[PDB]
Design a protein around this ligand. Structure first.
Ligand SMILES: [Mg+2]
Ligand SMILES: [Mg+2]
Ligand SMILES: [Mg+2]
Ligand SMILES: [Mg+2]
Ligand SMILES: [Mg+2]
Ligand SMILES: [Mg+2]
Lengths: 158, 160
């Protein structure tokens, strides 16, 4: 059913160029990939310092084409499966677009992928803002960040 | 405090070209504009059928530049005032990007505009999925869309 995710990307007010994606299923499965298709030269200051250095070394199989990431996610999210898929992220409007654009325009999103991502911050605030683990060491690694989202959600719903 | 909004747009897997935006405040105030800058030619069948027909005539003052719409919104959302700005939309991920892209990069969004839009669909499900009035036939007009969201938010929360 539930997947927690995060993306890193280069966004210029016009497009969102996907750097990486981390997704963690409530059942414990984890997916992380980094795109071979974004242009590192086009990254602004904040990304160069905080995002770029934390990426896998160049020879890692974690590096995948946009097409591989799409096919990886269709398998990882079980899009042909029994269960209803429910996507979650923390302040994920841009993340939601970044994920969806792996498929193309919204019309080309697979029929079982939700057309919205639930907002963890919204749930957090609606439960009166309960005390959370402080920020992990490596924030801006999308998988670490996606992990911490699931941790947060479990706390709030315990 | 709370604003409810909707955007209409041409989205192609690459960009989100803003057509119109409708915003309604909890205090009764309303804003609506249509961008002079999208290219009607690029629109798909759906946007040709359901969106373009509801737009104001060419002479309407509702047609504005993207620059004018930014300035209008900075005023309307009371960006320099002391209330916390809360934004709400129904299934608003692309809407949130469309709105925020009026300021360019996320970098450049006024500090006082929140970095996320609250998701009215999520709220609905949370409180038990209570039965809602039907959507207006007028929907697909971003202002009508935004008013209706405000109405749904009122009904969903009416015993909170
Ligand atoms: Mg992100
Ligand atoms: Mg590819
Ligand atoms: Mg996020
Ligand atoms: Mg909309
Ligand atoms: Mg539209
Ligand atoms: Mg809306």
């Amino acid at each position: 059913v539930r997947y927690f995710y995060d993306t890193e990307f280069i966004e210029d007010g016009h497009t969102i160029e996907l750097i990486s994606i981390g997704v963690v299923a409530e059942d414990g499965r984890e997916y992380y990939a980094v795109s071979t298709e974004f242009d590192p030269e086009r990254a602004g200051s904040w990304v160069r310092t905080h995002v770029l250095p934390k990426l896998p070394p160049p020879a890692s199989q974690l590096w995948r084409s946009r097409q591989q990431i799409r096919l990886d996610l269709e398998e990882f999210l079980r899009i042909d499966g029994t269960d209803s898929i429910e996507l979650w992220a923390w302040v994920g409007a841009y993340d939601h677009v970044a994920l969806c654009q792996l498929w193309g325009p919204m019309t080309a999103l697979p029929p079982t992928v939700p057309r919205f991502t639930r907002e963890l911050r919204q749930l957090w605030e609606d439960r009166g803002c309960p005390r959370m683990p402080p920020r992990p060491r490596d924030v801006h690694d999308a998988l670490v960040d996606a992990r911490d989202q699931l941790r947060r959600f479990r706390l709030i719903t315990s």
